[PDB]
Amino acid sequence: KVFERCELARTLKRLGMDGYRGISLANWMCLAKWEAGYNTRATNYNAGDRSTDYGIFQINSRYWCNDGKTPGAVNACHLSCSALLQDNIADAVACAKRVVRDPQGIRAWVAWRNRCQNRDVRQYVQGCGV
DSSP states (O other): OOOOOHHHHHHHHHHTTBBBBOOOOOHHHHHHHHTSBTTTTTTTEEEETTTEETTTTTEEETTTOOOOTTTOOOTOOOOHHHHHHGSSSSHHHHHHHHHOOOOOTGGGHHHHHHHTSSSGGGGGTTTOOO
């Protein structure tokens, strides 16, 4: 599923993402935008280390979810990576919450640092009524 901007904003807010571990809703929107373009079925294989990023938050199979083919991987979210490819983003959000419970927080995603950190991210939630 490819979410519309404001449709996703309201959905994330209902799932308790606004201010989660000090992270504002607009930061989560900026993240989803540059990670997969609001597309839940996006996957990206990293030929360099044999892992794959899955879904709307492009979560990595090496630490967070299990796909059975990534070497020495762990499954901290206790999920099959398949769960992060559904149209319903509930599990992906539950897993994203887990990722930021680690010290790095939102910085765990490099794209956030490149395209969201220290930027005016207000534009991601403007007019959505959240």
